[PDB]
From Swiss-Prot, chain B:
One of its GO terms (biological process) is CRISPR-cas system. It comes from the Bacteria. Pfam families: CRISPR_Cse2 (PF09485). Induction: Repressed by H-NS, activated by LeuO. Activated by the BaeSR two-component regulatory system, possibly due to envelope stress. Part of the casABCDE-ygbT-ygbF operon. The gene is casB. CRISPR (clustered regularly interspaced short palindromic repeat), is an adaptive immune system that provides protection against mobile genetic elements (viruses, transposable elements and conjugative plasmids). CRISPR clusters contain sequences complementary to antecedent mobile elements and target invading nucleic acids. CRISPR clusters are transcribed and processed into CRISPR RNA (crRNA). A component of Cascade, which participates in CRISPR interference, the third stage of CRISPR immunity. Cascade binds both crRNA and in a sequence-specific manner negatively supercoiled dsDNA target. This leads to the formation of an R-loop in which the crRNA binds the target DNA, displacing the noncomplementary strand. Cas3 is recruited to Cascade, nicks target DNA and then unwinds and cleaves the target, leading to DNA degradation and invader neutralization. InterPro entries: CRISPR-assoc_prot_Cse2 (IPR013382), Cse2_sf (IPR038287). GO terms for molecular function: DNA binding; nucleic acid binding; RNA binding. Disruption phenotype: Loss of resistance to bacteriophage lambda infection, loss of plasmid silencing. Increased levels of 57 nucleotide crRNA and also 2 and 3 spacer-repeat units. Belongs to the CRISPR-associated CasB/Cse2 family. It comes from Escherichia coli (strain K12). Keywords: Antiviral defense, RNA-binding. This is CRISPR system Cascade subunit CasB. GO terms for cellular component: protein-containing complex.
From Swiss-Prot, chain C:
Part of the Cascade ribonucleoprotein complex, with stoichiometry CasA(1),CasB(2),CasC(6),CasD(1),CasE(1)-crRNA(1). Interacts directly with crRNA, CasA, CasB and CasC. Stable subcomplexes of CasBCDE-crRNA and CasCDE-crRNA also form, both of which are able to bind target dsDNA, and CasCDE is able to form R-loops. CasCDE and CasCE complexes have endonuclease activity. Interacts with YgbT (Cas1). Binding of target ssRNA or dsDNA causes a conformational change in the Cascade complex. Belongs to the CRISPR-associated protein Cas6/Cse3/CasE family. Subtype I-E/Ecoli subfamily. It is an enzyme of class 3 (hydrolase). Keywords: Antiviral defense, Endonuclease, Hydrolase, Nuclease, RNA-binding. This is CRISPR system Cascade subunit CasE. NCBIfam families: casE_Cse3 (TIGR01907). It comes from the Bacteria. InterPro entries: CRISPR-assoc_prot_Cse3. GO terms for biological process: CRISPR-cas system; defense response to virus; RNA processing. One of its GO terms (cellular component) is protein-containing complex.
Swiss-Prot record, chain E:
It comes from the Bacteria. CRISPR (clustered regularly interspaced short palindromic repeat), is an adaptive immune system that provides protection against mobile genetic elements (viruses, transposable elements and conjugative plasmids). CRISPR clusters contain sequences complementary to antecedent mobile elements and target invading nucleic acids. CRISPR clusters are transcribed and processed into CRISPR RNA (crRNA). A component of Cascade, which participates in CRISPR interference, the third stage of CRISPR immunity. Cascade binds both crRNA and in a sequence-specific manner negatively supercoiled dsDNA target. This leads to the formation of an R-loop in which the crRNA binds the target DNA, displacing the noncomplementary strand. Cas3 is recruited to Cascade, nicks target DNA and then unwinds and cleaves the target, leading to DNA degradation and invader neutralization. CasCDE alone is also able to form R-loops. Induction: Repressed by H-NS, activated by LeuO. Activated by the BaeSR two-component regulatory system, possibly due to envelope stress. Part of the casABCDE-ygbT-ygbF operon. It comes from Escherichia coli (strain K12). Disruption phenotype: Loss of resistance to bacteriophage lambda infection, loss of plasmid silencing. Increased levels of 57 nucleotide crRNA and also 2 and 3 spacer-repeat units. The chain holds residues 183 to 362 of 363 of the full protein. This is CRISPR system Cascade subunit CasC.
C-alpha cells in the first residue's frame, strides 16, 4: 500500500494581493530565473486551519498563543465543569513550564499550539496523580511510557497532527513534539509576473480636495501551483494509531481545502474568490512535486491557464515514464484538455475525485 | 558645499506636476531624464560636477513624497539633530534586517531600498544631516546608520 | 503614393530624450513620421517608422525589419486605425507675456475634454474619412529639453473611407502638430 | 438559508476617463497575459456611496474625514439643539482620542468614517454617564458589554456596515471596529482594450471590435450574517433589501458623468445573482480574453455561461441562482431561473431566491 | 568520494518575512521573522572506487560492488535532504543522470564554472552546458570508457528510463 498522497493544484486568481511582506509588497520568489508571485505555506496552512470547511468537516482548530493568562481564563471557562480550578492551573503550569499565578500577564517563551482536548486528558491524568500523592517527575515518567494515548487526543487537533509542533519548555518538551504529517510548499505562479501598482487616495469629505499624495499598493493576478503531500503512516501515528481509513478521510478534506480555500488577505477589496481549475491527486512511495513543470516559465497563449495545465500534463508524462511510477492517479479539470497519458483516471467532478481518495484510489 | 534647507524648501514648494513626475523614477540616474529635476537642482550647484552625485541621491530620497521626510530643527541644547537611523528606529515601522540588508547593498541597490524605507517610515529628522550623510555615503556613513538604528532601539526599549 | 514602413529600435543611450530620438532617427538616413511603441526597454526604444527614404542600421539606431509599401484603398470599406497626436487650441497668452516683435505671445494649449478631442479628430480627417468608433487614450505629458512640453492623445478605432487619395494624402503628410516628437503617424488596418 | 450572496455583473460602458492614476492615465491590470482596463474597487464603492440611488434607497452616507475641528463645528451645528456643546465636545474627544478645544486645526490619525447618528447615540451615553457619576473608564467598560446597541446606529451609515471601518485611537478602538460585510473586486474588462493588431503586417492586406465601449466584469458578494450583525442584529429581510440595492448599483453605476452605453434602451447588460455557502468569483471566465464578434458583450456572456456551467457542475453548486440577460446567447443549462426584467431579479433577491 | 552540490548558476537568495499570529491577542503590529530561501539547479557528483569497495567489504565480488554503486546512483538521483521540506516541499526528482566508467575519477563541475545564464529557465542550458563540456573533455583526454545518460528532456548511450540506466550499471556497462 502506498504511503504518500500527493496533491497538485492549479488555481488561477484575478487581480489580487494574497500575501505580502513587512512592507506591503507581494511576496515573490525566483524560479527558473524569473519572478513568480508567491503565497507562503504558512498563509495557506492557516487559511485552511481557520476555514469554515475545516470547522464543519474536521473539527476544532488548535489555539495558538503565547499569553498564558488569557489561555488560563479560557481553560477555566471551558473546562471548569469537569475539573477543579487549580487542577486546571497546575496542568497548564506543568505543560507550559511556567508558574500560573492569578497574575494577568504570563507569557510563554514563544507562541505555541494548544489543543484543548489534549489539555483535558492531561487534567485527568494529573487529578489521578494527586489522588495518589504521586510526584510530578514520576508522572512525567508514567506519561512518557504511553505516548499513543496522548496522540489520540489530536483527533481534536488535526491541524497539529498534520503540521507538527515543537515546544521548548514544560512537560510538552518531552511529551508534545509532533512530527507533522503534511508537507506543503509555497505556492508560486507558473509564469513570470511583473506586478501592477494601484495608485490610491482617500477623499476627505470636509476639505477641498486640491493636490494630494497618492498611496501605492502592489497587486497582480496569476496562475498558482499548489503542492502538498500527506504521509499516511505518519498521520496514523500522530492520531494515536488511527486506521488508514481515517487518514484517507482527513487527506480527502485536505484535498478539498487545497482546491478551494484562498487566503483572506485583501479580499474585501480585491475579491479573488477563485476555485481551482485543476486538481490532481497521486499515490506514491516517494513524494514528488511537479513544480519543475514550470521551471521554464510558462508563456501565455490564450491565457496562462491552458498552457500551465498542458505543461503539468507533459511533465507528468515525462516523469511517470522515466522513473517508472505505478501509483494510483486521478485528475479533475474544469477544462477539456489535451489528454494526459491514459494511466490517469479522469474525474468529472471534485467530489468524485474525493470519493476516489477515500477509497484508497481504487473506486 | 550644497545648501540643504534651500533644496528642501524648493522641494516643498515645487509644483505638484513636476513633483509627481519626479517621484516616478525608480533609480537615481533616471532623474537625469527629467527636466523638472534640472530646474530644481540647478540653483544649488548642479552645474558643478563635484556636487552632482550627491544631488542625485538627495532628490531621490526626497522623491519619496513631498512630505514623507519631515524636517525638524535640532534643539539648541543638542549639538546635532535627529539622524536618519534614529528616526527610522523611532518610527517603529522598520525591521532591523531591512537596515542590515540596506548597508550591505551595493551602490544603487542601496538608494532604492532606502527610499522604500523612507516612504514606509515617514521619518522626522534633521534634514541637512541626512544631506551630509548622502553627500559622502561611504562604508562608515552606512555603518553609522546601522549604529544609530540599533542603539536607539536598544535605548528606547 | 509609395512609402516604407520599418520597425526600428534606438539604444537607451540615445533614447534618453524626445529630441535625441528625432536625431537618432535622421542619422540613419543620408522626411518621415514615427510612432513610439515601447519607450524604454533595457535594449532601448522600439519605434514604427514611416518614411520616404531607406533606413540602414547604425550604432545606436538598429533597424529590425523593413518592407516597402504603397497604398491601395477602396472607398466605402471600413478600417481600423491608430493615431497619436496633440490636439491644441492657439490663444493669446492670458499671462500676457510678450514676443520679440513686441506684442503679446501666442500659446498652444491642449484640449482636455474627450468630446473636444474627438471633434478635433473628425475635423482633422474631414472629408477623407468618417470616424465610426473612437477611443481617445489619455497619455502622460511629454517633456523635452530649447525646453518644453507637449500633451498627446492616442486615438484607436474604426473609420470609413470617403476619399481614398485624400486619406492617403493625410497618411503621408501626418496629422497634427509636433510631427517630429512622435505624433502624426496614422496607421490603418483591414477590419 | 445560504449565508453568502454572489453578484456577477457584465456592464458595458466607456473605457476612458473613469479611474486615473497619478499621471493622467486610466487604470488597468494584467489578466491572463493581456492588459484589461480597470476600475478600482475604492472608486466603485465611493461612486455607489455618493450616488443618488443610494441617497434615495439606502440613506445618508458616512462622513469620512480627518479634520476633527471641522467635524466639531459640524457636530455642533447638527446636534447643538439636542445636547449641550460641552457634551458634544466631550464625546468627540472620547471617540477620537484627541482634545477638542476651539483651536483652528485638530487632526485625527487617519481619515475615518463617521456616522452622525452614531455620534449622537454616544452623546446620549456620555450625558447619561455624567448624570450617573460614571468615570470614562467604567463608561468604556459598560459600553463594551452591548455592542449591537452601537451597531444599530449603522442603519444610518450602511456604507460602513458594508465595507468596514478601523480606528487607531479613542474609544472607537474597542467600540468602533467594524468588519465589512461586502467584498468587492476591481472591475476588469473581459477583453483586451488595446486594438488586437500588428500594424506592420496589416498594411500589406489593405468579428469587429468596439472602442467607445467596453465590457467590464464586476464581482461582489455580501455576507448576510455579517451584515445583520453590523446593522445591530437586523433581519435577513433588511439584509436582502440592502443587498438588492447593491445588485442594482453594481449593475448600473459608472463613476463620473458617464453612464452605461445603452442606458436609455435597456436597464442592465447582464446580471446574475447566486446564493451559496462559500463565495466564488467568476473572473476566470475571462482569463482567456474574449475576442469580439458583434462587439464584446455576447461573446462575454457566452464565456460567462460556459464557465458557470463547468464550475457549477464540477464543484457541485446547488444553491439558488437567477440571471437577467436579454441577449440570445446559448442558454445556461443549470437550474438558473431566467428573469425577463431587472426589477424581477431584484425582487427575486428581495425574496431570498424563490419568487 | 562525493562533492558538495552547487548550483550551476548564480543565486541571490530571497527572504520570506513571516509572522506568528496570536489567536488571543487582538491584532497589533508585530515584528516579523526572516528565512532565506531560493530555488536552483544543482549539480551533484560522486564517484565509487570499486576496488576499494570490494576490499572494504572483506573481498566481495565486483558484482556486489556494482550493485551497491547502482543503489548509490538511485539515491543520488532521487534523495533530497529533509531540511525545511515540511514548509517548502522541494520534492523534486533529477532531470538528468549520467554514469561513466573510468580509470581516473573526474568531475564535471567545470562545465558550470562559467555560470549558466538563464534562457527558458536554468535547466536546459545547464544540461546543454554539461553535454558540451563532456564532449570536450572526452575528446581531449581520450576517454574510452563505458558511459550512459538518462534524461527527461528530448558515444554516450541514451537511456529512456532510470531503471535501464541502473541495469546498465549493474551489468558493468555492457
Amino acid at each position: 500500500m502506498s504511503n504518500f498522497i500527493n496533491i497538485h493544484v492549479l488555481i488561477s486568481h484575478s487581480p489580487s494581493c494574497l500575501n505580502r511582506d513587512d512592507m506591503n509588497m507581494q511576496k515573490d520568489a525566483i524560479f527558473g530565473g524569473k519572478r513568480r508571485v508567491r503565497i507562503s505555506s504558512q498563509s495557506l496552512k492557516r487559511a485552511m486551519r481557520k476555514s469554515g470547511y475545516y470547522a464543519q468537516n474536521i473539527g476544532e482548530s488548535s489555539l495558538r498563543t503565547i499569553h498564558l493568562a488569557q489561555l488560563r481564563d479560557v481553560l477555566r471557562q471551558k473546562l471548569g465543569e469537569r475539573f477543579d480550578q487549580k487542577i486546571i492551573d497546575k496542568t497548564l503550569a506543568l505543560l507550559s513550564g511556567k508558574s500560573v499565578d492569578e497574575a494577568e500577564k504570563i507569557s510563554a517563551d514563544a507562541v505555541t499550539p494548544w489543543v484543548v482536548g489534549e489539555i483535558a486528558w492531561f487534567c485527568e491524568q494529573v487529578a489521578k496523580a494527586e489522588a495518589d500523592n504521586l510526584d510530578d517527575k514520576k508522572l512525567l515518567k508514567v506519561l512518557k511510557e504511553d505516548i499513543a494515548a496522548i496522540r489520540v487526543n489530536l483527533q481534536q487537533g488535526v491541524d497539529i497532527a498534520l503540521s507538527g509542533r515543537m515546544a521548548t519548555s514544560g512537560m510538552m518538551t518531552e511529551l508534545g513534539k509532533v512530527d507533522g504529517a503534511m508537507s506543503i510548499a509555497h505556492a508560486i505562479t507558473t509564469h513570470q509576473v511583473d506586478s501592477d501598482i494601484d495608485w490610491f487616495t482617500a477623499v476627505d469629505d470636509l476639505q477641498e480636495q486640491g493636490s494630494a499624495h497618492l498611496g501605492t499598493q502592489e497587486f497582480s493576478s496569476g496562475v498558482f501551483y499548489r503542492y502538498a503531500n500527506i504521509n499516511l503512516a505518519q498521520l496514523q501515528e500522530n492520531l494515536g494509531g488511527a486506521s488508514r481509513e481515517q487518514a484517507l478521510e482527513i487527506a480527502t478534506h485536505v484535498v478539498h481545502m487545497l482546491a478551494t480555500e484562498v487566503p483572506g488577505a485583501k479580499q474585501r477589496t480585491y475579491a479573488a474568490f477563485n476555485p481551482a481549475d485543476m486538481v490532481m491527486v497521486n499515490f506514491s512511495d516517494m513524494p514528488l512535486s511537479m513544480a519543475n513543470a514550470f521551471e521554464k516559465a510558462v508563456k501565455a497563449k490564450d491565457g496562462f491557464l491552458q498552457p500551465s495545465i498542458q505543461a503539468f500534463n507533459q511533465y507528468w508524462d515525462r516523469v511517470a515514464n522515466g522513473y517508472g511510477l505505478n501509483g494510483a492517479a486521478a485528475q479533475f479539470s474544469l477544462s477539456d484538455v489535451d489528454p494526459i497519458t491514459a494511466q490517469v483516471k479522469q474525474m468529472p467532478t471534485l467530489e468524485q475525485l474525493k470519493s476516489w481518495v477515500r477509497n484508497n484510489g481504487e473506486a | 558645499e550644497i545648501d540643504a534647507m534651500a533644496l528642501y524648501r524648493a522641494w516643498q514648494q515645487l509644483d505638484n506636476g513636476s513633483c509627481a513626475q519626479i517621484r516616478r523614477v525608480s533609480e537615481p540616474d533616471e532623474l537625469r531624464d527629467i527636466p523638472a529635476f534640472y530646474r530644481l537642482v540647478q540653483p544649488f550647484g548642479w552645474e558643478n560636477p563635484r556636487h552632482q552625485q550627491a544631488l542625485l541621491r538627495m532628490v531621490f530620497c526626497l522623491s519619496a513624497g513631498k512630505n514623507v521626510i519631515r524636517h525638524q530643527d535640532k534643539k539648541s541644547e543638542q549639538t546635532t539633530g535627529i539622524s536618519l537611523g534614529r528616526a527610522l528606529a523611532n518610527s517603529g515601522r522598520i525591521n532591523e534586517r531591512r537596515i542590515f540588508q540596506l548597508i550591505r547593498a551595493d551602490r544603487t541597490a542601496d538608494m532604492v531600498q532606502l527610499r522604500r524605507l523612507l516612504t514606509h517610515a515617514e521619518p522626522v529628522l534633521d534634514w541637512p544631516l541626512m544631506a551630509r550623510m548622502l553627500t559622502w555615503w561611504g562604508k562608515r556613513e552606512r555603518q553609522q546608520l546601522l549604529e544609530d538604528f540599533v542603539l536607539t532601539t536598544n535605548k528606547n526599549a | 503614393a509609395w512609402m516604407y514602413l520599418s520597425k526600428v529600435i534606438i539604444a537607451r543611450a540615445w533614447s534618453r530624450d524626445l529630441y535625441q530620438l528625432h536625431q537618432g532617427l535622421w542619422h540613419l538616413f543620408p522626411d518621415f513620421l514615427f510612432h513610439v511603441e515601447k519607450r524604454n526597454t533595457p535594449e532601448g526604444c522600439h519605434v514604427l517608422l514611416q518614411s520616404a527614404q531607406m533606413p540602414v542600421s547604425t550604432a545606436v539606431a538598429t533597424v529590425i525589419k523593413t518592407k516597402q509599401v504603397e497604398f491601395q484603398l477602396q472607398v466605402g470599406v471600413p478600417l481600423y486605425f491608430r493615431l497619436r497626436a496633440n490636439p491644441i487650441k492657439t490663444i493669446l497668452d492670458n499671462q500676457k507675456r510678450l514676443d520679440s516683435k513686441g506684442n503679446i505671445k501666442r500659446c498652444r494649449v491642449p484640449l482636455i475634454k474627450e468630446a473636444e478631442q474627438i471633434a478635433w479628430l473628425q475635423r482633422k480627417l474631414g472629408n477623407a474619412a468618417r470616424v465610426e468608433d473612437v477611443h481617445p487614450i489619455s497619455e502622460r505629458p511629454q517633456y523635452f529639453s530649447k525646453s518644453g512640453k507637449i500633451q498627446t492623445v492616442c486615438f484607436e478605432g474604426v473609420l470609413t473611407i470617403n476619399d481614398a487619395p485624400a486619406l492617403i494624402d493625410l497618411v503621408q503628410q501626418g496629422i497634427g502638430p509636433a510631427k517630429s516628437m512622435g505624433c502624426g503617424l496614422l496607421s490603418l488596418a483591414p477590419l
